[PDB]
Amino acid sequence: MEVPEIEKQIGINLYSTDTTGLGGQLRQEIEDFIVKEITNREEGEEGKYLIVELTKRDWDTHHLTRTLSRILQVSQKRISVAGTKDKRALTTQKISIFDTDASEIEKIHLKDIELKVLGRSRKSVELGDLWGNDFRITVRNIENSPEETEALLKKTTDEILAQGGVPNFFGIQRFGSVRPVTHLVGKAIVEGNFEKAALLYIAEPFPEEPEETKNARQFVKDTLDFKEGLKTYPLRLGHERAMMNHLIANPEDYSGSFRVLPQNLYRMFVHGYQSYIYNIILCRRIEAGIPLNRAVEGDIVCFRNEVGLPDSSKTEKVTSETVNAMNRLLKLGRAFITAPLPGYNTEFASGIPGEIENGVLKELGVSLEGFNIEKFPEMSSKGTRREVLLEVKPKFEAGEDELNPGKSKAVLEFMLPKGSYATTVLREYMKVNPLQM
């Protein structure tokens, strides 16, 4: 088949499913993307925190909270969410509001916003206080008929249901906010180059950015005139600006140009390059014909940390004897085949899977001894071992779409746990450019 360069530039280069790309488009209509949160907490009747179910239509969370904070005259902090839902969509979620009574929110009537009291609690709603998110996505404008699409959906589903779900690939958005350069920067540092790792972040324009800022980076990218850059770069880019300043007093000090950014990107770059390698590996293994929900000799799995979450801490290695027991646990949801996120404390697997892992680090010319940045040790990671399959059991629904006469539409509704993304599920169903998505 065919995969966009955009996705091949970040390790991904195929599809666990051999079905045809459903194609089509998304977010054509606000209601075409419904996301309903699943809570993991309970509230009572007491507490200085009012808990409300927020339903918003085509609203940006920051904007909403900034609106409610003005109406209730409290700081933005007093209103928190468990997780930020998409603006262009119809989304429901739980939130908390400090020192506010039920009756007050019954008098607030904003456009495309619905507020419903759930109760009260002595505890605010912190990022993470939710189990998962129910989805109801709708793909429209497919070059197929309702009949040829429903059948196309059932096949894509079947393989999925059989393989256990969809690959746990690192989305194109994970490598960068608006510009996916993290992995590109983490690769230069490892190799030792700081002249490029710093420039790739300071400059290096992308077709996603406005031709204005796009021309600001392009400028210093071929002139290295950081003095001008600190004059053209919009204040919006604090990190890039902070770095150019360090380069005005300390010339050619690209090595320490990273000591201006907090612990955020500080380690995101290296983690990116890791996610990159991890993608490739996950593919090569999908090519080798070794499924993601079945163990083999020296496959290396993980177990849930007694919290219902797979952790790269306790990782038992499967052998020629425990193989029968390992696979038996997978179908019981107590183990998961994992893939390596290269570092300096990585434990390659053995057998066929071990060959794949070593075959990716080989062609890539990767060096485990390289994940120890000399200039920035704090920036050097030892590696981890993320799972491979992303549990998912979708339910499709095909048909004719009114908005696009002659074309068909698909209603994909499933659910994911906090930390996972819907694009990861959609890609196997639409198999289209991540930007056309």
Side-chain angles (χ1 to χ4, degrees):
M1 266 188 76
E2 290 285 51
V3 169
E5 274 295 281
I6 286 314
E7 284 176 347
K8 302 161 100 177
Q9 295 164 172
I10 57 182
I12 308 171
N13 84 309
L14 57 98
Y15 301 96
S16 89
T17 63
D18 58 66
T19 45
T20 176
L22 199 157
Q25 55 188 200
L26 309 186
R27 270 96 147 71
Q28 214 201 303
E29 288 304 332
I30 317 297
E31 288 68 22
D32 278 359
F33 209 95
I34 299 186
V35 182
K36 303 184 178 188
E37 186 197 80
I38 313 174
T39 207
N40 65 40
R41 46 134 74 201
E42 175 73 335
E43 335 296 333
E45 299 297 13
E46 281 145 279
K48 67 206 175 80
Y49 278 111
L50 197 291
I51 319 306
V52 194
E53 182 189 285
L54 170 55
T55 308
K56 67 188 213 317
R57 178 174 184 295
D58 191 17
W59 271 85
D60 177 47
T61 306
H62 272 24
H63 189 270
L64 203 199
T65 59
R66 191 245 249 159
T67 287
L68 292 181
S69 89
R70 277 158 170 167
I71 298 174
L72 303 161
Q73 300 290 287
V74 299
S75 75
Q76 236 167 306
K77 178 71 195 314
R78 331 308 312 210
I79 151 95
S80 68
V81 297
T84 298
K85 322 296 168 166
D86 286 330
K87 137 66 165 287
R88 190 161 181 69
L90 170 56
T91 77
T92 303
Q93 73 190 124
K94 167 175 295 184
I95 64 164
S96 72
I97 307 178
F98 172 64
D99 184 16
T100 300
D101 294 315
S103 47
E104 300 193 56
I105 46 190
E106 242 295 15
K107 192 165 208 69
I108 298 179
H109 302 286
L110 281 158
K111 193 192 174 288
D112 284 343
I113 294 292
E114 197 148 72
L115 294 182
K116 314 176 188 169
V117 181
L118 293 171
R120 300 187 66 80
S121 160
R122 311 177 194 298
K123 66 211 289 289
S124 63
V125 174
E126 300 293 313
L127 289 173
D129 295 20
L130 84 168
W131 175 274
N133 277 148
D134 272 344
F135 289 95
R136 170 97 188 181
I137 306 175
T138 295
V139 194
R140 292 183 182 295
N141 205 195
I142 175 179
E143 66 182 304
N144 283 305
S145 70
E147 280 215 59
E148 274 208 345
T149 300
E150 182 161 294
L152 206 173
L153 285 165
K154 188 274 159 289
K155 221 193 187 304
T156 313
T157 300
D158 149 278
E159 279 180 58
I160 289 180
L161 237 46
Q163 177 193 56
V166 313
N168 199 70
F169 282 118
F170 268 98
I172 179 61
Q173 294 182 297
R174 307 282 71 72
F175 298 88
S177 295
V178 61
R179 182 184 61 175
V181 284
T182 57
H183 67 101
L184 299 171
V185 179
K187 185 186 174 189
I189 309 174
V190 167
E191 302 173 353
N193 296 293
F194 277 75
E195 178 96 23
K196 301 302 174 181
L199 257 52
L200 289 171
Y201 189 81
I202 298 167
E204 180 93 323
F206 274 30
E208 188 89 320
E209 310 175 62
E211 69 114 359
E212 231 59 74
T213 68
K214 183 206 302 167
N215 272 62
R217 294 178 188 283
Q218 237 308 323
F219 182 81
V220 304
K221 178 160 176 295
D222 35 59
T223 52
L224 297 179
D225 175 4
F226 312 119
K227 303 184 293 74
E228 183 68 12
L230 202 91
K231 179 80 186 67
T232 184
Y233 279 56
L235 299 161
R236 169 169 56 80
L237 305 170
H239 301 320
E240 282 85 308
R241 288 177 55 228
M243 299 186 59
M244 301 186 97
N245 284 309
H246 182 80
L247 293 169
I248 74 164
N250 304 175
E252 299 298 68
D253 202 51
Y254 304 108
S255 51
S257 70
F258 292 107
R259 236 170 185 59
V260 289
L261 319 169
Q263 45 67 285
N264 201 190
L265 282 302
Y266 193 54
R267 310 190 81 243
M268 288 196 119
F269 308 123
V270 174
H271 176 286
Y273 184 53
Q274 277 182 174
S275 298
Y276 170 70
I277 294 164
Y278 164 100
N279 279 143
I280 308 180
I281 289 169
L282 216 178
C283 291
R284 217 64 77 191
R285 184 157 182 300
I286 292 174
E287 292 181 312
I290 314 289
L292 311 180
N293 55 173
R294 283 179 187 166
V296 300
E297 293 181 356
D299 226 335
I300 290 183
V301 307
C302 79
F303 312 96
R304 57 186 67 277
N305 57 11
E306 324 306 351
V307 186
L309 171 65
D311 65 339
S312 61
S313 298
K314 324 290 270 61
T315 47
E316 186 176 311
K317 191 166 191 172
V318 44
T319 53
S320 300
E321 49 264 52
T322 67
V323 56
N324 288 27
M326 288 314 102
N327 192 218
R328 187 272 188 168
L329 258 45
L330 282 155
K331 300 199 179 185
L332 225 68
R334 208 201 309 180
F336 319 80
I337 298 305
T338 77
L341 263 165
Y344 69 65
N345 184 284
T346 312
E347 180 198 315
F348 309 153
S350 287
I352 294 174
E355 281 185 301
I356 299 175
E357 308 194 2
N358 287 287
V360 175
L361 317 172
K362 194 178 181 182
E363 67 170 351
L364 238 51
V366 185
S367 57
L368 296 295
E369 314 154 306
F371 271 93
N372 288 66
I373 300 67
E374 295 180 299
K375 318 290 293 186
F376 269 49
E378 330 78 3
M379 188 185 273
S380 74
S381 177
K382 39 79 174 176
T384 146
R385 207 156 235 281
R386 269 285 209 177
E387 59 279 299
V388 175
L389 165 65
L390 195 156
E391 173 71 4
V392 284
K393 182 167 188 46
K395 298 168 286 182
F396 63 87
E397 174 80 49
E400 177 184 60
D401 75 321
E402 324 69 52
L403 281 78
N404 299 285
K407 321 288 172 56
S408 308
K409 64 172 185 186
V411 181
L412 280 167
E413 50 192 349
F414 52 87
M415 66 159 266
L416 268 32
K418 53 157 164 170
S420 56
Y421 297 100
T423 49
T424 295
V425 175
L426 292 179
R427 193 181 95 88
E428 299 299 309
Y429 279 82
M430 289 167 88
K431 298 192 184 69
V432 291
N433 189 291
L435 300 183
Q436 172 210 313
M437 193 103 81

PDB file of all heavy atoms in Angstrom, residues 245-272:
ATOM      1  N   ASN A 245      18.682  34.038  22.975  1.00  0.00           N
ATOM      2  CA  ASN A 245      19.348  34.992  23.854  1.00  0.00           C
ATOM      3  C   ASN A 245      20.645  34.407  24.407  1.00  0.00           C
ATOM      4  O   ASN A 245      21.672  35.083  24.430  1.00  0.00           O
ATOM      5  CB  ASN A 245      18.435  35.399  25.014  1.00  0.00           C
ATOM      6  CG  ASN A 245      17.356  36.368  24.590  1.00  0.00           C
ATOM      7  OD1 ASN A 245      17.638  37.395  23.968  1.00  0.00           O
ATOM      8  ND2 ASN A 245      16.110  36.058  24.934  1.00  0.00           N
ATOM      9  N   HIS A 246      20.584  33.151  24.850  1.00  0.00           N
ATOM     10  CA  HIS A 246      21.738  32.442  25.410  1.00  0.00           C
ATOM     11  C   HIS A 246      22.833  32.316  24.373  1.00  0.00           C
ATOM     12  O   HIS A 246      23.992  32.070  24.704  1.00  0.00           O
ATOM     13  CB  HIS A 246      21.341  31.035  25.857  1.00  0.00           C
ATOM     14  CG  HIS A 246      22.462  30.263  26.481  1.00  0.00           C
ATOM     15  ND1 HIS A 246      22.854  30.452  27.788  1.00  0.00           N
ATOM     16  CD2 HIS A 246      23.292  29.322  25.970  1.00  0.00           C
ATOM     17  CE1 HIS A 246      23.877  29.658  28.058  1.00  0.00           C
ATOM     18  NE2 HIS A 246      24.162  28.964  26.971  1.00  0.00           N
ATOM     19  N   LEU A 247      22.451  32.470  23.115  1.00  0.00           N
ATOM     20  CA  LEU A 247      23.392  32.366  22.020  1.00  0.00           C
ATOM     21  C   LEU A 247      23.931  33.719  21.581  1.00  0.00           C
ATOM     22  O   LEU A 247      24.783  33.784  20.697  1.00  0.00           O
ATOM     23  CB  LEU A 247      22.732  31.657  20.840  1.00  0.00           C
ATOM     24  CG  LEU A 247      22.396  30.184  21.083  1.00  0.00           C
ATOM     25  CD1 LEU A 247      21.518  29.672  19.953  1.00  0.00           C
ATOM     26  CD2 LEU A 247      23.678  29.369  21.183  1.00  0.00           C
ATOM     27  N   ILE A 248      23.438  34.800  22.188  1.00  0.00           N
ATOM     28  CA  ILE A 248      23.920  36.137  21.833  1.00  0.00           C
ATOM     29  C   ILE A 248      25.137  36.499  22.689  1.00  0.00           C
ATOM     30  O   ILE A 248      26.063  37.164  22.226  1.00  0.00           O
ATOM     31  CB  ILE A 248      22.830  37.242  22.028  1.00  0.00           C
ATOM     32  CG1 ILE A 248      22.629  37.541  23.516  1.00  0.00           C
ATOM     33  CG2 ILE A 248      21.524  36.807  21.393  1.00  0.00           C
ATOM     34  CD1 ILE A 248      21.888  38.841  23.793  1.00  0.00           C
ATOM     35  N   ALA A 249      25.126  36.047  23.940  1.00  0.00           N
ATOM     36  CA  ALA A 249      26.211  36.310  24.877  1.00  0.00           C
ATOM     37  C   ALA A 249      27.189  35.148  24.852  1.00  0.00           C
ATOM     38  O   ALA A 249      28.399  35.326  24.998  1.00  0.00           O
ATOM     39  CB  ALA A 249      25.648  36.481  26.281  1.00  0.00           C
ATOM     40  N   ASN A 250      26.647  33.953  24.665  1.00  0.00           N
ATOM     41  CA  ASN A 250      27.446  32.741  24.628  1.00  0.00           C
ATOM     42  C   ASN A 250      27.423  32.113  23.231  1.00  0.00           C
ATOM     43  O   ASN A 250      26.709  31.134  23.000  1.00  0.00           O
ATOM     44  CB  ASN A 250      26.903  31.743  25.657  1.00  0.00           C
ATOM     45  CG  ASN A 250      26.852  32.318  27.069  1.00  0.00           C
ATOM     46  OD1 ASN A 250      26.349  31.673  27.986  1.00  0.00           O
ATOM     47  ND2 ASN A 250      27.375  33.528  27.247  1.00  0.00           N
ATOM     48  N   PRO A 251      28.212  32.661  22.284  1.00  0.00           N
ATOM     49  CA  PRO A 251      28.279  32.153  20.910  1.00  0.00           C
ATOM     50  C   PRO A 251      28.783  30.713  20.767  1.00  0.00           C
ATOM     51  O   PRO A 251      29.743  30.305  21.426  1.00  0.00           O
ATOM     52  CB  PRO A 251      29.198  33.155  20.220  1.00  0.00           C
ATOM     53  CG  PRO A 251      30.121  33.543  21.321  1.00  0.00           C
ATOM     54  CD  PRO A 251      29.168  33.766  22.465  1.00  0.00           C
ATOM     55  N   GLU A 252      28.127  29.958  19.888  1.00  0.00           N
ATOM     56  CA  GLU A 252      28.470  28.564  19.626  1.00  0.00           C
ATOM     57  C   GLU A 252      28.240  27.687  20.850  1.00  0.00           C
ATOM     58  O   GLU A 252      28.761  26.577  20.924  1.00  0.00           O
ATOM     59  CB  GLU A 252      29.932  28.444  19.184  1.00  0.00           C
ATOM     60  CG  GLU A 252      30.267  29.191  17.901  1.00  0.00           C
ATOM     61  CD  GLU A 252      29.498  28.676  16.694  1.00  0.00           C
ATOM     62  OE1 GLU A 252      28.261  28.853  16.649  1.00  0.00           O
ATOM     63  OE2 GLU A 252      30.134  28.089  15.792  1.00  0.00           O
ATOM     64  N   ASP A 253      27.457  28.181  21.805  1.00  0.00           N
ATOM     65  CA  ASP A 253      27.182  27.420  23.021  1.00  0.00           C
ATOM     66  C   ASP A 253      25.858  26.671  22.904  1.00  0.00           C
ATOM     67  O   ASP A 253      25.033  26.673  23.825  1.00  0.00           O
ATOM     68  CB  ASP A 253      27.164  28.353  24.237  1.00  0.00           C
ATOM     69  CG  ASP A 253      27.416  27.615  25.546  1.00  0.00           C
ATOM     70  OD1 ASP A 253      28.409  26.857  25.623  1.00  0.00           O
ATOM     71  OD2 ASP A 253      26.632  27.802  26.502  1.00  0.00           O
ATOM     72  N   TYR A 254      25.668  26.030  21.755  1.00  0.00           N
ATOM     73  CA  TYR A 254      24.465  25.256  21.490  1.00  0.00           C
ATOM     74  C   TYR A 254      24.304  24.167  22.548  1.00  0.00           C
ATOM     75  O   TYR A 254      23.188  23.758  22.866  1.00  0.00           O
ATOM     76  CB  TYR A 254      24.550  24.634  20.094  1.00  0.00           C
ATOM     77  CG  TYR A 254      24.782  25.652  19.003  1.00  0.00           C
ATOM     78  CD1 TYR A 254      26.012  25.737  18.358  1.00  0.00           C
ATOM     79  CD2 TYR A 254      23.790  26.562  18.647  1.00  0.00           C
ATOM     80  CE1 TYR A 254      26.256  26.707  17.387  1.00  0.00           C
ATOM     81  CE2 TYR A 254      24.022  27.539  17.673  1.00  0.00           C
ATOM     82  CZ  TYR A 254      25.261  27.603  17.049  1.00  0.00           C
ATOM     83  OH  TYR A 254      25.515  28.559  16.093  1.00  0.00           O
ATOM     84  N   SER A 255      25.419  23.703  23.101  1.00  0.00           N
ATOM     85  CA  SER A 255      25.362  22.659  24.118  1.00  0.00           C
ATOM     86  C   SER A 255      24.508  23.081  25.307  1.00  0.00           C
ATOM     87  O   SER A 255      23.623  22.340  25.731  1.00  0.00           O
ATOM     88  CB  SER A 255      26.779  22.274  24.588  1.00  0.00           C
ATOM     89  OG  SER A 255      27.560  23.403  24.955  1.00  0.00           O
ATOM     90  N   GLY A 256      24.767  24.279  25.826  1.00  0.00           N
ATOM     91  CA  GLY A 256      24.018  24.774  26.967  1.00  0.00           C
ATOM     92  C   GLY A 256      22.809  25.610  26.601  1.00  0.00           C
ATOM     93  O   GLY A 256      22.158  26.189  27.473  1.00  0.00           O
ATOM     94  N   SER A 257      22.497  25.682  25.312  1.00  0.00           N
ATOM     95  CA  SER A 257      21.344  26.461  24.880  1.00  0.00           C
ATOM     96  C   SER A 257      20.047  25.795  25.347  1.00  0.00           C
ATOM     97  O   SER A 257      18.980  26.383  25.249  1.00  0.00           O
ATOM     98  CB  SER A 257      21.337  26.615  23.357  1.00  0.00           C
ATOM     99  OG  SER A 257      21.052  25.385  22.725  1.00  0.00           O
ATOM    100  N   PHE A 258      20.148  24.576  25.873  1.00  0.00           N
ATOM    101  CA  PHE A 258      18.979  23.845  26.348  1.00  0.00           C
ATOM    102  C   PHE A 258      18.704  24.074  27.819  1.00  0.00           C
ATOM    103  O   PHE A 258      17.635  23.720  28.321  1.00  0.00           O
ATOM    104  CB  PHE A 258      19.169  22.351  26.128  1.00  0.00           C
ATOM    105  CG  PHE A 258      19.164  21.952  24.692  1.00  0.00           C
ATOM    106  CD1 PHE A 258      20.342  21.582  24.061  1.00  0.00           C
ATOM    107  CD2 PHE A 258      17.978  21.936  23.967  1.00  0.00           C
ATOM    108  CE1 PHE A 258      20.343  21.202  22.728  1.00  0.00           C
ATOM    109  CE2 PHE A 258      17.968  21.558  22.632  1.00  0.00           C
ATOM    110  CZ  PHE A 258      19.154  21.187  22.012  1.00  0.00           C
ATOM    111  N   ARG A 259      19.680  24.653  28.511  1.00  0.00           N
ATOM    112  CA  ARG A 259      19.568  24.915  29.946  1.00  0.00           C
ATOM    113  C   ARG A 259      18.728  26.154  30.246  1.00  0.00           C
ATOM    114  O   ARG A 259      18.752  26.681  31.359  1.00  0.00           O
ATOM    115  CB  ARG A 259      20.971  25.068  30.554  1.00  0.00           C
ATOM    116  CG  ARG A 259      21.256  24.113  31.714  1.00  0.00           C
ATOM    117  CD  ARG A 259      22.727  24.130  32.127  1.00  0.00           C
ATOM    118  NE  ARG A 259      23.043  23.130  33.149  1.00  0.00           N
ATOM    119  CZ  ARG A 259      22.867  21.815  33.009  1.00  0.00           C
ATOM    120  NH1 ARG A 259      22.368  21.321  31.884  1.00  0.00           N
ATOM    121  NH2 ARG A 259      23.202  20.985  33.991  1.00  0.00           N
ATOM    122  N   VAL A 260      17.977  26.605  29.248  1.00  0.00           N
ATOM    123  CA  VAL A 260      17.123  27.775  29.395  1.00  0.00           C
ATOM    124  C   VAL A 260      15.651  27.361  29.467  1.00  0.00           C
ATOM    125  O   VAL A 260      14.796  28.114  29.943  1.00  0.00           O
ATOM    126  CB  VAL A 260      17.346  28.739  28.216  1.00  0.00           C
ATOM    127  CG1 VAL A 260      18.715  29.402  28.335  1.00  0.00           C
ATOM    128  CG2 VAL A 260      17.272  27.974  26.914  1.00  0.00           C
ATOM    129  N   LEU A 261      15.373  26.151  28.995  1.00  0.00           N
ATOM    130  CA  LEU A 261      14.025  25.588  28.991  1.00  0.00           C
ATOM    131  C   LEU A 261      13.871  24.689  30.221  1.00  0.00           C
ATOM    132  O   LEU A 261      14.803  23.973  30.586  1.00  0.00           O
ATOM    133  CB  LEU A 261      13.823  24.744  27.727  1.00  0.00           C
ATOM    134  CG  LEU A 261      14.390  25.279  26.403  1.00  0.00           C
ATOM    135  CD1 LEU A 261      14.321  24.193  25.338  1.00  0.00           C
ATOM    136  CD2 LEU A 261      13.625  26.516  25.972  1.00  0.00           C
ATOM    137  N   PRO A 262      12.691  24.699  30.867  1.00  0.00           N
ATOM    138  CA  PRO A 262      12.472  23.864  32.053  1.00  0.00           C
ATOM    139  C   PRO A 262      12.632  22.390  31.717  1.00  0.00           C
ATOM    140  O   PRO A 262      13.070  22.052  30.622  1.00  0.00           O
ATOM    141  CB  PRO A 262      11.045  24.218  32.459  1.00  0.00           C
ATOM    142  CG  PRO A 262      10.396  24.530  31.147  1.00  0.00           C
ATOM    143  CD  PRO A 262      11.446  25.379  30.472  1.00  0.00           C
ATOM    144  N   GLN A 263      12.277  21.519  32.658  1.00  0.00           N
ATOM    145  CA  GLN A 263      12.365  20.066  32.466  1.00  0.00           C
ATOM    146  C   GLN A 263      11.358  19.508  31.454  1.00  0.00           C
ATOM    147  O   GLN A 263      11.266  18.292  31.275  1.00  0.00           O
ATOM    148  CB  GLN A 263      12.169  19.354  33.802  1.00  0.00           C
ATOM    149  CG  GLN A 263      11.010  19.887  34.657  1.00  0.00           C
ATOM    150  CD  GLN A 263       9.619  19.642  34.069  1.00  0.00           C
ATOM    151  OE1 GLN A 263       9.197  20.307  33.118  1.00  0.00           O
ATOM    152  NE2 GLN A 263       8.899  18.685  34.644  1.00  0.00           N
ATOM    153  N   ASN A 264      10.608  20.402  30.807  1.00  0.00           N
ATOM    154  CA  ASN A 264       9.599  20.019  29.818  1.00  0.00           C
ATOM    155  C   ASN A 264      10.305  19.421  28.611  1.00  0.00           C
ATOM    156  O   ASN A 264      10.733  18.266  28.646  1.00  0.00           O
ATOM    157  CB  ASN A 264       8.771  21.242  29.388  1.00  0.00           C
ATOM    158  CG  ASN A 264       7.411  20.864  28.788  1.00  0.00           C
ATOM    159  OD1 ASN A 264       6.710  21.715  28.222  1.00  0.00           O
ATOM    160  ND2 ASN A 264       7.030  19.596  28.923  1.00  0.00           N
ATOM    161  N   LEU A 265      10.436  20.204  27.543  1.00  0.00           N
ATOM    162  CA  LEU A 265      11.112  19.719  26.344  1.00  0.00           C
ATOM    163  C   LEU A 265      12.473  19.178  26.748  1.00  0.00           C
ATOM    164  O   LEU A 265      13.025  18.303  26.081  1.00  0.00           O
ATOM    165  CB  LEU A 265      11.292  20.842  25.314  1.00  0.00           C
ATOM    166  CG  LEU A 265      10.080  21.243  24.471  1.00  0.00           C
ATOM    167  CD1 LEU A 265       9.564  20.033  23.700  1.00  0.00           C
ATOM    168  CD2 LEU A 265       9.001  21.811  25.371  1.00  0.00           C
ATOM    169  N   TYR A 266      12.998  19.709  27.847  1.00  0.00           N
ATOM    170  CA  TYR A 266      14.294  19.304  28.381  1.00  0.00           C
ATOM    171  C   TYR A 266      14.576  17.835  28.078  1.00  0.00           C
ATOM    172  O   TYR A 266      15.685  17.471  27.697  1.00  0.00           O
ATOM    173  CB  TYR A 266      14.319  19.538  29.897  1.00  0.00           C
ATOM    174  CG  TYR A 266      15.694  19.453  30.514  1.00  0.00           C
ATOM    175  CD1 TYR A 266      16.745  20.234  30.024  1.00  0.00           C
ATOM    176  CD2 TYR A 266      15.953  18.577  31.573  1.00  0.00           C
ATOM    177  CE1 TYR A 266      18.022  20.139  30.566  1.00  0.00           C
ATOM    178  CE2 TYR A 266      17.227  18.474  32.125  1.00  0.00           C
ATOM    179  CZ  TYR A 266      18.257  19.255  31.616  1.00  0.00           C
ATOM    180  OH  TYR A 266      19.521  19.136  32.144  1.00  0.00           O
ATOM    181  N   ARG A 267      13.560  16.995  28.234  1.00  0.00           N
ATOM    182  CA  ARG A 267      13.726  15.583  27.971  1.00  0.00           C
ATOM    183  C   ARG A 267      12.750  15.057  26.912  1.00  0.00           C
ATOM    184  O   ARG A 267      12.767  13.869  26.583  1.00  0.00           O
ATOM    185  CB  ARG A 267      13.578  14.797  29.280  1.00  0.00           C
ATOM    186  CG  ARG A 267      14.425  15.344  30.427  1.00  0.00           C
ATOM    187  CD  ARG A 267      14.441  14.406  31.632  1.00  0.00           C
ATOM    188  NE  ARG A 267      15.392  13.312  31.464  1.00  0.00           N
ATOM    189  CZ  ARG A 267      15.061  12.028  31.416  1.00  0.00           C
ATOM    190  NH1 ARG A 267      13.791  11.659  31.527  1.00  0.00           N
ATOM    191  NH2 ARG A 267      16.006  11.112  31.249  1.00  0.00           N
ATOM    192  N   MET A 268      11.898  15.930  26.373  1.00  0.00           N
ATOM    193  CA  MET A 268      10.939  15.507  25.347  1.00  0.00           C
ATOM    194  C   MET A 268      11.653  15.119  24.058  1.00  0.00           C
ATOM    195  O   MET A 268      11.267  14.166  23.381  1.00  0.00           O
ATOM    196  CB  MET A 268       9.926  16.614  25.039  1.00  0.00           C
ATOM    197  CG  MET A 268       8.890  16.865  26.129  1.00  0.00           C
ATOM    198  SD  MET A 268       7.365  17.910  25.451  1.00  0.00           S
ATOM    199  CE  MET A 268       5.922  16.627  25.769  1.00  0.00           C
ATOM    200  N   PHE A 269      12.698  15.856  23.716  1.00  0.00           N
ATOM    201  CA  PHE A 269      13.436  15.548  22.511  1.00  0.00           C
ATOM    202  C   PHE A 269      13.889  14.090  22.512  1.00  0.00           C
ATOM    203  O   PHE A 269      13.476  13.314  21.651  1.00  0.00           O
ATOM    204  CB  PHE A 269      14.634  16.476  22.386  1.00  0.00           C
ATOM    205  CG  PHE A 269      14.277  17.919  22.519  1.00  0.00           C
ATOM    206  CD1 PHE A 269      14.874  18.705  23.493  1.00  0.00           C
ATOM    207  CD2 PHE A 269      13.354  18.503  21.662  1.00  0.00           C
ATOM    208  CE1 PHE A 269      14.541  20.048  23.626  1.00  0.00           C
ATOM    209  CE2 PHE A 269      13.016  19.847  21.789  1.00  0.00           C
ATOM    210  CZ  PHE A 269      13.618  20.621  22.765  1.00  0.00           C
ATOM    211  N   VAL A 270      14.722  13.713  23.482  1.00  0.00           N
ATOM    212  CA  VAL A 270      15.226  12.340  23.552  1.00  0.00           C
ATOM    213  C   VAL A 270      14.075  11.328  23.571  1.00  0.00           C
ATOM    214  O   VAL A 270      14.145  10.292  22.905  1.00  0.00           O
ATOM    215  CB  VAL A 270      16.161  12.114  24.801  1.00  0.00           C
ATOM    216  CG1 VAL A 270      16.534  10.640  24.920  1.00  0.00           C
ATOM    217  CG2 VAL A 270      17.448  12.944  24.668  1.00  0.00           C
ATOM    218  N   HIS A 271      13.014  11.634  24.318  1.00  0.00           N
ATOM    219  CA  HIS A 271      11.848  10.751  24.406  1.00  0.00           C
ATOM    220  C   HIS A 271      11.179  10.637  23.035  1.00  0.00           C
ATOM    221  O   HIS A 271      10.584   9.606  22.690  1.00  0.00           O
ATOM    222  CB  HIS A 271      10.855  11.286  25.447  1.00  0.00           C
ATOM    223  CG  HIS A 271       9.588  10.495  25.545  1.00  0.00           C
ATOM    224  ND1 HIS A 271       8.599  10.547  24.586  1.00  0.00           N
ATOM    225  CD2 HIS A 271       9.133   9.649  26.501  1.00  0.00           C
ATOM    226  CE1 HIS A 271       7.592   9.773  24.947  1.00  0.00           C
ATOM    227  NE2 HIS A 271       7.890   9.216  26.107  1.00  0.00           N
ATOM    228  N   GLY A 272      11.275  11.706  22.255  1.00  0.00           N
ATOM    229  CA  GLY A 272      10.703  11.680  20.925  1.00  0.00           C
ATOM    230  C   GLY A 272      11.471  10.650  20.117  1.00  0.00           C
ATOM    231  O   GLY A 272      10.896   9.647  19.691  1.00  0.00           O
TER     232      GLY A 272
END
